[PDB]
Structures are given as C-alpha cells and as structure tokens.
Write an enzyme that holds these catalytic residues in place. Structure first.
Site, short mmCIF file in Angstrom:
data_model
loop_
_atom_site.label_atom_id
_atom_site.label_comp_id
_atom_site.label_asym_id
_atom_site.label_seq_id
_atom_site.Cartn_x
_atom_site.Cartn_y
_atom_site.Cartn_z
N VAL D 147 80.51 58.08 17.65
CA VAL D 147 80.34 57.08 17.35
C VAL D 147 80.24 56.01 18.51
CG1 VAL D 147 80.97 54.82 16.06
CG2 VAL D 147 80.85 57.04 15.00
N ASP D 149 80.27 52.51 19.74
CA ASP D 149 80.88 51.38 19.63
C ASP D 149 80.24 50.12 20.83
OD1 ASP D 149 81.96 48.97 18.25
OD2 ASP D 149 84.02 49.92 18.17
N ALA D 175 84.59 58.51 19.36
CA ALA D 175 83.96 57.19 19.41
C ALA D 175 83.97 56.67 20.72
CB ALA D 175 84.69 56.10 18.43
N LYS D 176 82.90 56.14 21.18
CA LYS D 176 82.73 55.65 22.53
C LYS D 176 83.11 54.26 22.39
CE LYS D 176 79.37 54.15 26.26
NZ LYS D 176 77.96 54.32 26.36
N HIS D 177 84.41 53.84 22.98
CA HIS D 177 85.01 52.62 22.71
C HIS D 177 84.82 51.58 23.90
CE1 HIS D 177 87.83 49.65 20.74
NE2 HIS D 177 87.73 50.41 19.77
#
Lengths: 323, 323, 323, 323
Positions: D147, D149, D175-177
C-alpha cells in the site's frame, strides 16, 4: 540573571488549569478564580511528586483571565507551593511590551520563571520569534523562561533555526513541545539546542524519546496532572529505571485513557475547543473541583465534552491504580 | 442606546494607522505614539471628505499598542475630529471582559463606536462569535459596533448564520468585510443581514457590489486613506452619480496602484507581514509621517517592503491626480 | 488549426454526465455506459437550447471511465448532436502524451474540441500548466480547447500569469471557471485574457458578471442541464434582454433549488463526494435516467445523497416552470 | 492467492526510478525508457544487497510513463532480477478497473506483487480506500500488495480504521509509510495492523522505530538506493546488530547528505517539484545514468535542481565510503 538552568528541569513538568467559581462563564463576573481550590491543587501537585509547576498556558485560560485574576491566582499558587518546587507563571499577551510588564510583576510575586507563548494576531517568523524571546529575556533577566511551542495557538511551529538561536539565550531553560505530534521536528529541534534547553514532549511519548536520547530527554510536560499525577510520576520512575517493557505498557495505558479526547480522533478539531474539552476532563476526573470556562470560550459541541468526560473518568482509574 | 444606525454608515469608512515615533520599534519605549501627527492626520481625513473614521484594526497595530497608548491615541483622534464625523475606536483583546472594559473607557473618551475584532487564541465558532458580540453590545449599549471580519487574524470567516443573528443586535451597524476576497460569501452575508447592517467591501471592489446592489452597498472601507483619501472619496462620488464606465476605470487604477502589495501576488503571504508591509506603504506615500512598527512585528523580508513602498508611491500619484 | 474561436463560445455551455447501466458500480462490469440514454440526453440538450455541449469533466466521471467507454460515449454523443452545436470531449489523463493520444482519437470520432483538465499526481505550477496546454495545442492544432480550471481536482488554481500566456494560444477558446467561488481571481483572469478567452462562470453567478462585463462574459457553464436545461437557457435570454430584476430573481431561484447540495452548507465537504452527490441529483431530477457511479467513487454518507436528491427534485420544479 | 506474506518483507525495500533516454522530456518521444540501464540498475540493486525491489511510485514517474513504457520497463526489471528478490511493480491509475487491468498484466509479466497507490481525482475516504484495495486484491489474488501511503499525491493520509481493515486482506503484506513525517500516525497504524502488515518507514528514521519496535519494524523503504545502496544496507546490518550509536551516527550522515534536497529547508516546496528534484539527485550521484523527466513534470526552478544535485553528490560520497 536567574539561578535556574536547563539542569533544574527534570522529571514531571506539571501544568495546572485555573480553578473557577460557578459563575465564571458570565461576562459580568469581575473575579472568577477559586483561590481556595488553586491553593489546594498546587499543594496536591507538590505532594503528588510533580517536579516543576506551570500555570496559565492554553487550557489554563491565559487568554481569558483578567490581569487581576492572573496575578492573584499566581500569587496564591506560589504561596501554596512555598518554595518546594520551581513555579513558572504563564504570561502571554498580544505584544512584547505587555508580556514584559506582566512578567516583571509575576516575578515580583515570587514566580521562579515565566511560561511564555508569543503574540499571535499576526504570525511571527523565526526571526520575529527569536527577537521576541530575546526582548523578554533581556528585559526581565532574573526570570527563567519556558518557551511555549504551540503551533495552532500561535500560528506556526517554531523553526529549528529559531531553536538554535533560542539555545543561546541563557534564560531559556526549557520548551513545551508537541512531541510526535510535530513529527520529525522534535528530533531536529533537539539537535539544535544541543543540551542547552530541555525539550519537553508529552508524557504520552516521553518514553519513546527518553529511550532514544536518555541523557537529554529527562523531563516531560503533562496537562493531565490535575486529574491525578500518580500515572505520570510513575512513568518518570520507570524511565529512570530504564524498565522499557513497563514504560511501553504504561504508555499504552495513558494513551488508552485519553483515547476519546480528540473528536473522531481529529487533533485539529480538538484544538478548536481545547479549553472547553479539557475543562470537562478536569471536572470528570474528580481530583480537583472547578466550574465552567471563562468568556468567550463557552461554546462547544456537546459530544466533544462527552469525549473529555470519558477521558477524565478513565484517567481517574489510572490515578487510583498508581496512587 | 447608541443613536447611530446602519443609515449613518454611508460613503468612505476610512481606517487610519497609528503614527509612531522613531524609537517605536524598541521594547523599552514607554510611549511610542506621535500624537501631533495623529491629530493632523485625523483632521486631514475629515477635511478630505472621509465619512466615518476608524482606528486600530490590524495595520493600526491594535495588537501591539499599550493600553495607555490606545487611550491617548483615540482621545487625540476624537478631539481632532471634534464631532464632525463618527469615530469608531478599534478595541480587540484576547477575551470578552477586557474588550468590554476597554470599550467602556473608549466611549468615556468620546468615541462614537467600537471597531471590534474578536479573541483569537482559540478560534470561535458561529455560536461563540454571536455570544461575544452580544456580550459586548449588552455591556456597552451606548456604543455602536463595526464587526471586524478578518478571517486570517481571528482564525475563521464569520458564517452566514452568525451574520443573521448579528443583524438582530441594534448596536451592530456595519461589518468590515473582505469583499471579493471571500467571493460568494459577501452576497450570502448581505442577504443574511437584510439591510440592517452595512456590509463594507474594499474600495477596490466597491463599484462591483454597488452597481449590483445599489440600495444596500452604499459604503466601503479603505485602509489606504492615510496615503491620500482623494481617490477613495472620488470613487464614492462616481458611484453616487452611477458613472459606471468611470467607476470601472478608477477601480482599475486603484488595483494597478496596489498590484505590488502582495508578494508574488501571494495574498496569504501578505497576511503574514501586513503590519510591516502597510507601514512601508504609508511612509512611501508621503501623505502622513510615521516611524517603524511596534514590537513584535518588526521582522520582514526586504522585498516585501519593496512592494509596499511602490504601492505607496503609486497611490501618491493617484492622490495628486484626484485631489 | 481549428475554425472554432472565442467568438463561437456564447450562451449556455452545458456539461452532461455519463449515463450508466444499473451494474456500473461493480469493478467486474467491463462496459457501463448506457449509450441509448447518452444519445437521447445529447439530443435533449440540443433541443432544449444548449449552445455548447461538453462531456466527461469531474461529475462526468472522466476519472473512472475506461478508454473504450470514453470513445464509445463521445462517439455516441457526437453522432446524436449531428453537428447542430459544438461538442467538446472531456479528455484528462495523468500525463501529456496519454492526453494527446486520447485527444487525437476523440477528434477522429468527430469532436469539435477537447475539454481538458491537467495531470495532477504532482501539482503543476504556472509554467508547467502553460507548457502542458501548449503541448496539447501543438499536437492537435485542429481542436479547440476549453481549459478546466478545477483547483480541487488538479491541486491548484490556475494563476493569472498562466492565463496571460494561455490567451496567446489560439486553440484556447474558453475556460471553465469558478466564478464567485474564487471571486477576485475571476476578474484578474478576465483582464489577463483581454477578450481572447471566454471565462465561463457558473450559471448561479453568470448574471452578476454579465451585467458588469456585458462584452466579455457572454456565456456560462452549467452542470445542471441534465436535470433540465430550461431554467438556464431562460437565464441566457434574460441576460441578453438586460432584464436585471428578472435575472436576479431567477438567480435566487437557482441557488434556492441547489441549497441542499452542500452538506450543512459545507462546500468543501461536497467536493469530497461530488461525483456521488451529483449522481443522486441527476437521478432525482427525472430529466434523464442513470445508474450508480463507477468504482472507486461508490462510498458516500447516505445523508449527503439525500441532499443531492432534494436538489434534483427542486430543480425539476424549475425545469417544469420554465419549459 | 500469493505465497508472499508479511514475513517476506524484511530489510531494505528499494524503490528505483525509471531510467530515461536524452529525449525523454519531449511529448513527441514515443518511448523514453532506457531499458539497458533499467536492467543494469535492477541487477546492481540485487548485487548491492537490496532485499525487496519496487518500481514506479511517484519519483519513478508512474504518472507520466505510457502503459507500453510501464509494461516494457517492468518486464526488463523482472527478467534482470530473475527471481533473486521479490519485485513489486508500481501500478496506479485514476480508477479501480484500469488498475486491476494493469495489475493483472504486470503479474503475467512476472512481477511478484503490485506497489499500488489509489485514485486521486477525488479523494477517497477510509471506506473508499478499503473498497479500492479489496477490489484490487479480489481481482488479482495472485499478487501481493504494498500500500502506497502518500498523503500529498493521493489527497489524504490513510486513516487508522482503514489500516485495520487492510490488515485483514491477505494480499496486503506491506505499506510504504511516511515515518516521522506523520508523527503519531505511524504508531497508531502500527497498532492497527498488529503484525499482519509491514509498515515501512524511511531509511532516515528506520533506526528510531526499529529500536523501539524491533519485532515489527524490520524493514524500511528507500528512494535513494539508485544513488548507491551501500549506506542503506549497512544501516540494515547495523540495526540487526543493535549497534545503536552507529545507527544514530549513520542516520545523521544520511540526513546531512540529503539536506539540500529541500529548498531553504522548505519541505512543502520540495513536494511541488519532487519528480524534477529527485531526477537531478539521481543524475548527480552517478550510480546510474538517466536523462530528463517526462512531460508534464519538466518545469522547475534551477536552484531547486542545484539542491538535488548537491544531494546526489553528497550521497555518492556515502556510497563510496560504505561500498
């Protein structure tokens, strides 16, 4: 100049609200401070292990107290503390000269330092922020200063270059910070002051920053101590003992108790009504007694007060457990 | 009750700055107002045909004058006007009760009304905005009120439901409005007040609203009259004569003269330094004399002052043309 | 080059949605356009007096239609109009080369011009905006262009300097604008184009701008024509006749009908669900039939849909009144 | 379903840009990927010890490559990696059905998973975000999902309730945060996914989260690996060895090398031109060869590019030291 330095700001910097009488929400009420409750509250913070006491930031209604209420309240708090811990009197006005005049008088009442925001009719850039604190420090050199870094109230986050210059002002001993709420800024600001200023995160993220920077992040601020200070003083001892598992467990408990404080979890919405919401939290926790808020901050969606009351009740259970 | 009503607010509502002495940018300056220039400037506004005079909004440094300075300046302006036109004294503080206390005194000093912003440490929603102005009006019923609708300064545009309730307060006779800078809102607010409150656009878009709503929009406000009021009173006379082609040509001249005011056309950026930029414009225009701005609003990018001074010089040419 | 010029853009610029089949909200539905309804709707617009027809802007679901759906829809609309009025096909992709390739094909299918937004993964500055429209104009010089100035969708209001340069591109004949929703900018942009580009306000504020600038603002856009075009073509006729009192009354009726569109009057909230809310308005108005919206814009508070439905019913009454 | 799980996302998740040919900035260039450079870059990432490879996020110009360009680039990367590490192909379009169609084809071309942003013409609320990713997961269940983000790119930060729902989707493995750029959100999201999704902070704050949550934060993403991956894989080894003093020193070195990326320290100003600035960094570091950016993101101030170039030079020195 002051004898207080960064070395004196350790442990729990507790910030108390200003107790109010039942008619405090009426514009015709000339004097609305409950001084009896102010004295017992300040004494309870000392006896509860708070290391530094501050008054009249945002939720202490620095904006809405009259000068006579503010000085009389501070005088009462100072007298009740009776020299046991340092007391910083919150002094924030719309301009530099009024803040200097208030701060001079608050020092004459026995306050050990000043907890100072900045004028916000217009925002101040980093140049103007530094100029303001240098002006206050040079005018009242006897008072230590806690910088009030409230981006929403004062229309801007204090820049890291401003923190670099503030760390050259000897009177500046600490700054009340947003912690993780400002994100990467706390770490940048920390490097900027280079141990010359105590950067205070909230008690809900003190453990994270203290484990990463144990020699520098040796203190926090808490706006919750008036609901019962035992959870926060216990956190201080756990951090000193480097009991990281227990620190994490307690931090989760603290965050869980305050979970309903922000409407729909929205921080910016909470700040639009922070005075009103915190007031409901203080009432519900039952550690102190207080009436309503002062004009003009008496309007708020009722569901927001419900969140505050539930946060107060949950914190009350933490206070009971850790007392 | 005040004798003033909406019918009294017609023509040019001029807003003047507060002339300062050369040391006015120093925190140690006890009194920084040039009272001689204040009196001559107020008299020049009357002789120049300004219909209503107001003091100490944002660029008048309501935030940064001391209470002593504000009283003295307003008394000097009232004395110089000598009852020839209504004088509204800018009174805005951090809370309702200080604003009431100041407003009473300014009325005692001969002001006909109060030019009132609102507390901005926390934003006020429409309910808190209405209650604030109701509190002020009920406490000082002898003063007419001009509502100061400054969204950037006070952290929010006044909502249309609030304007509906404000138009039920007899003391509220006008509102200083953003005009096209809140494009759809001026018309929505105009219907909300239904002829009971004079909604004041800027002089730079007065013609547009006057031609579309000739019976209601019979006045504007101008922060440029201290650069020379002749272009603004001429616009009023063109509008009264319904010289629409001439109104458009003059409106274009006003806009072109003020083009450099906003750095890179960036309005929000001009808001950050409006006190500093406007001060540079008043100096360059030559119509009045003034020193520097008051602490803390002394820091500003140099090129932002460049845009202010060229606007002052441009306006000066309009004043000479239309005098 | 295109034979269409700014002179050809007069009257009502009607923007239609893309009629959908009942299963259009399902990701497994490969082809979701009701082509029969597209043809009858397009023909109804011509017969209803619409002067220029445009497709697939925001509420036309330019974002969520497949390339095969867009070609078939545009071809069906073009064939139904059969050259009676100019047809501008909405073509907006994430980059310049996909938009050019789509625009060439849409021209092959018989569109007279392209109704073009701009890439928005990153915002474009004014130089990047002009470069993009120049690239499109140069690659398909046979197609007239309508600039889509949607600040929310494309992450920025098109700057006045960009408008100056765009007005030197002969293919740029019009711009779908915000009107009083960015009030000051509409006038700045209007001076910038100096009559070379038709700046289209909404039908709800067309009267205001057409009275002030009768030679320039000779056309509006309407996203409501698919609910019944009669109220808007009537407004065109009233404006032409300079019947300003009737123009104002009709404007008030249009605004009254659309009141419930915005959840609690909050415009910004409406933009969050504009595709869904508009879809409910088209369904409820009964002038055309359509299914639900396409993925991913299928989630929306139920109460927001009810506001769109009431506006569609209110509009259908105006359509009945003026047909 | 995919056989990749959260357990397989450990270490350095490297994101590479899309190598371009010298004419890549021209809209007339049909195909602009340097496929030879892409193969050698991908192989250099495997040889340099990158644990997971991802393509075509924001700086990889996912927005501006053609579909044919994305297919050929991903196929080349997949073949050069040859199954040695997992490859996640970046696929983000304006709608669910184009993204599903692209994702299926990228899986047929050998990608192990999809690096997926979300449609952004309109913002998606948390319900819309979850429905989109669920739609993608159910339609291409053979692909694991990362994901993306990116609040600025997709018009909003993914809410904590959405993360909880996303963690019940088996295909969602990471998830790439934003790490500390979204301060308290990282920890809230981390609690929400409860070990079922790997939350990837940046290289520049991975040490802080990894020390506090060593069981959970076992991986980061880095957009700097195409300047030389040796500093990042060293950081990974340092974290695994719990060499905290070295981790802090190395983190400071990475921040120091990248400080000129942001014009005048202004982050927001960087985001307006991130594709252009990052491209200058990639060129200057000399680890890979690439040409200019693709239309429309070709316009940028020259001083901003100069800041990226010095960032690239500074990183190259780190690459040489740790290589």
């Amino acid at each position: 100049d002051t004898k207080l330095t960064v070395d004196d700001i350790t442990g729990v910097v507790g910030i108390i609200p200003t107790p109010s009488i039942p008619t405090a929400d009426q514009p015709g009420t000339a004097f609305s401070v409950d001084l009896d409750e102010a004295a017992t509250l300040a004494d309870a913070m000392v006896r509860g292990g708070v290391d530094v006491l501050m008054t009249t930031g945002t939720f202490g209604e620095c904006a809405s107290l009259t000068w006579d209420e503010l000085q009389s309240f501070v005088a009462t708090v100072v007298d009740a503390v009776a020299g046991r811990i340092p007391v910083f009197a919150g002094a924030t006005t719309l301009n530099t000269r009024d803040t200097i005049a208030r701060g001079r008088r608050l020092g004459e009442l026995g306050a050990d330092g000043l907890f100072v925001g900045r004028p916000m009719w217009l925002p101040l850039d980093d140049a103007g922020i530094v100029r303001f604190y240098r002006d206050v420090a040079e005018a009242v050199p006897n008072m230590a200063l806690v910088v009030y870094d409230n981006p929403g109230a004062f229309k801007g986050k204090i820049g890291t270059p401003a923190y670099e210059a503030l760390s050259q002002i000897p009177q500046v001993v600490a700054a009340k910070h947003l912690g993780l709420l400002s994100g990467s800024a706390f770490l940048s600001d920390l490097r900027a002051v280079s141990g010359r200023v105590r950067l205070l995160p909230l008690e809900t993220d003190w453990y994270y920053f203290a484990r990463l920077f144990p020699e520098e992040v040796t203190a926090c601020w808490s706006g919750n101590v008036a609901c019962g200070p035992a959870p926060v003083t216990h956190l201080r001892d756990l951090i000193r003992a480097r009991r990281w598992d227990d620190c994490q467990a307690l931090t989760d408990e603290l965050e869980g108790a305050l979970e309903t404080l922000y409407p729909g979890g929205n921080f910016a919405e909470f700040l639009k009504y922070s005075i009103q919401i915190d007031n409901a939290q203080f009432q519900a926790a039952g550690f102190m007694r207080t009436g309503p808020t002062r004009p003009p901050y008496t309007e708020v969606p009722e569901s927001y007060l419900a969140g505050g009351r539930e946060a107060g009740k949950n914190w009350a259970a933490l206070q009971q457990r850790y007392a």
